[PDB]
Design an enzyme around this catalytic site. Structure first.
Site: not given
Ligand SMILES: [Zn+2]
Ligand SMILES: [Zn+2]
Ligand SMILES: [Zn+2]
Ligand SMILES: [Zn+2]
Ligand SMILES: [Zn+2]
Ligand SMILES: [Zn+2]
Ligand SMILES: [Zn+2]
Ligand SMILES: [Zn+2]
Ligand SMILES: [Zn+2]
Ligand SMILES: [Zn+2]
Ligand SMILES: [Zn+2]
Ligand SMILES: [Zn+2]
Ligand SMILES: [Zn+2]
Ligand SMILES: [Zn+2]
Ligand SMILES: [Zn+2]
Ligand SMILES: [Zn+2]
Ligand SMILES: [Zn+2]
Lengths: 457, 450
Positions: B163, B235
């Site tokens: 992220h 993802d």
């Molecule tokens: Zn993450």
């Molecule tokens: Zn993930």
């Protein structure tokens, strides 16, 4: 007589050692789980775990949908009044949904549907499907059928129907003035609908007086229960009282009168809203059996009926598995007994993981005397502290060395380290008292206190 | 119908969501806390989905650290499960899976098969992860939900989060195969139904690209050497590990050319950009058309493999159908509203009325009245009276009736008998105080009642 517990259904507002004692000694067949337990998921889960090891139970809730909702697991429903306005198939589909979810958690009975009619005197208010007896009957039938496909046995309430009174049985004994022909045509119509089908159901009585018919509250009325429910309606199934301690009964009858009338009237299971009242009622029933005021035949037939319901249940699903996982994932070092009766200082990370931290003090208070609760910063570690006994709920001990020595500067003679996140950190506390939970969840923390007081010492 | 190659996350449910779903027809719907935390929206969304074709409906409810469904009892998590007889993992996931399936979900994005290095992982021992991982996939499936193992090829060996950046795992292929890949392999060999989600992680001893975008990792390793013929998900593509290092077009190309089937978007509003991007690349030839067809074939199998009678959106229909209204003047409704809401569980329902109203109306003020008195006199462009216990006495009934009848709407939300006490007035009867009912009463006011 090791079977007299089968005549009792007990409500639990808490789960603790008294609860366990009462259950193990009296073996009630029915367990009703109240918000006191449900609002603390750790207690609910541990309770479900316990029930699975102590024989067979009818396990129930008051989750009606709408105004009475007690299970967070069931999505919320507008309720019966709204359902009543709509195609009854939707009621059947909702109750299957609710029942399936209930059945997965470990419930096998629900105290619903409400079959009482809505009147303008009554207000209760949203809990009824409607005024029209036909609308109530078809929704009630869809509801019993849905609950049943979902895996839970319904219990229709409250016989013979008491929507025609303004009074509430939690406050006084209410009165319904209707003639028997009116009850039959109306309030009893949805009950008749269920009895004419092949759905297995229980029936709960109303603590309500019907003076055009009999002097006694229906719960205590041989006319309403034997001559009407058993004989004219032909109901052979399980009959439950509403909770006997309720004022409508307790302020007008003795415990011994209530137990006598209800069993003599044809009822099978005495509902107590408090499991702690069981020893009084249990002993009262036992007396009345020995002095002959209760026909033994009625007690045996009642026991027979409960046994049929108990054997029907058969289920694989119990949410208490979660409590076992938590229990079994706990590793601890050896702890001195003599420390544990002392007053504890809690060191808890400062703050979903944050809400788990907020709940640690509440859980600790069930098992230990608590002197202070201190919220430390995990990137600094605990200020130095002392106490009779200290619980360090360690999170991220290894970020740096000035944090690892905040944690190690605590008096090793009277500190227990709870490693609740990164279990690798446990190497960094040699010689120290250590509990590894492998989880931040309230049930794990809870099981860690149980091991601390039990197995680890 | 390229929408079958998309799996979209929804943090909200509104007309854009409805527009996007109806125009593009994504096969996959992932429901985020933005919807789940508002049960009225969750229920209404489910009802919408049951009327617009077939969907794969999923959540991130892993248990433990990541929990998003309040309907599923809370679980200590994988690290705790790893310590225990794996049968308990199987039981947990059946339970969770059954509850999920009853609500209307047909897929879960779990289990995590990533190894623990120095809570979401079952452990360090690849063998332990494999046995819990199989039990979890089996349990989920038995419960009624298709599992999705994540994240291939396993990325417990990196401290970095995708992220934030594109992380790196330096292990050799021999080591990945022996260790991180072992639980993935045990599951394909056991042949339990599952989907696979890829990791946005770079493995520099093996290849230059992140696994999500890597033909070597997805085709030569996952498809050929591990023999997985099933559904392959990315993802979320917007995640910085991908978005800060590749263009939308590079990400779409690489992933489909690599052997992937469904593109996960964490935001349904991004669908048109990615969708047109996929449409473009197919037209100019950068994407083999054969791959798209194969992907569509796989998605079509999962869509029909999934059935269910169960959808919790029936609750939204009950609430919808139980609403009665008088006729309403369209041109009041664009005005700014003053809410009269009973003060303060029926109390929690009242507290939520303002939040629900703000979705449908401009709100000027919110006044919490005492229902033993009724509303103080009030004026405004438009007034909403959430009537409770109007009939207690005549001083309460005339507090409610002293409100300007040209611009007041009475919501009778408890005792529907009170409605006789408001002749000539604008009246809405909900037959319920629940947020879904209040919500559905606003939709009717803006739609059918006007
Ligand atoms: Zn993450
Ligand atoms: Zn993930
Ligand atoms: Zn009742
Ligand atoms: Zn009451
Ligand atoms: Zn009548
Ligand atoms: Zn009651
Ligand atoms: Zn005794
Ligand atoms: Zn005998
Ligand atoms: Zn045990
Ligand atoms: Zn142990
Ligand atoms: Zn460990
Ligand atoms: Zn992962
Ligand atoms: Zn290694
Ligand atoms: Zn072709
Ligand atoms: Zn509709
Ligand atoms: Zn309508
Ligand atoms: Zn009505």
């Amino acid at each position: 007589d090791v079977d007299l517990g089968k005549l009792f259904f007990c409500g639990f507002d808490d789960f603790n050692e008294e609860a366990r004692e009462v259950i193990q000694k009296y073996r009630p067949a029915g367990v009703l789980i109240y918000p006191g337990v449900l609002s603390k998921e750790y207690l609910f889960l541990d309770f479900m775990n316990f029930l699975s090891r102590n024989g067979r139970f009818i396990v129930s809730s008051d989750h009606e949908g709408g105004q009475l909702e007690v299970l967070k697991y069931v999505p919320s429903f507008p309720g019966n009044l709204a359902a009543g306005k709509v195609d009854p198939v939707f009621t059947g589909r909702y109750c299957e949904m609710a029942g399936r979810i209930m059945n997965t958690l470990g419930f096998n009975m629900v105290f619903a549907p409400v079959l009482d009619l809505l009147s303008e005197k009554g207000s209760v208010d949203l809990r009824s499907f409607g005024s029209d007896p036909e609308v109530v009957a078809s929704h009630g039938m869809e509801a019993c059928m849905g609950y049943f496909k979902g895996g839970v046995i319904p219990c229709i309430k409250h016989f013979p129907g008491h929507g025609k009174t303004a009074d509430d049985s939690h406050y006084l004994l209410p009165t319904v003035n209707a003639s028997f022909e009116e009850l039959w045509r109306e309030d009893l119509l949805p009950f008749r609908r269920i009895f004419q089908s092949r759905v297995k159901t229980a029936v709960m009585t109303a603590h309500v007086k019907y003076p055009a018919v009999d002097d006694l509250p229906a719960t205590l009325s041989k006319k309403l229960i034997t001559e009407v429910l058993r004989e004219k309606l032909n109901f052979k199934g399980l009959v439950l009282s509403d909770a006997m301690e309720m004022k409508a009964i307790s302020e007008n009858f003795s415990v011994e009168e209530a137990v006598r009338f209800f069993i003599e009237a044809g009822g099978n299971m005495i509902l107590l809203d408090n499991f702690r009242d069981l020893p009084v009622y249990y002993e009262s029933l036992k007396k009345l059996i020995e002095d002959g005021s209760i026909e033994r035949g009625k007690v045996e037939r009642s026991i027979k009926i409960v046994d049929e319901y108990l054997s029907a249940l058969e289920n694989r699903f119990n949410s208490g598995l979660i409590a076992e996982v938590a229990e079994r994932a706990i590793e601890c070092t050896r702890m001195r007994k003599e420390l544990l009766g002392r007053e504890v200082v809690l060191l808890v990370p400062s703050n979903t993981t944050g809400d788990d931290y907020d709940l640690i003090p509440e859980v600790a208070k069930r098992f230990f005397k608590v002197r202070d609760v201190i919220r430390y910063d995990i990137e600094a570690g605990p200020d130095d502290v002392d106490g009779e006994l200290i619980f360090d709920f360690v999170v991220n001990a290894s970020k740096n060395e000035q944090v690892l020595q905040a944690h190690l500067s605590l008096p090793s003679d009277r500190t227990i380290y709870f490693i609740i996140r990164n279990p690798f950190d446990a190497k960094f506390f040699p010689g120290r008292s250590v509990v590894i939970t492998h989880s931040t969840k309230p049930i794990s923390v809870y099981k860690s206190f149980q091991h601390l007081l039990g197995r680890c010492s």
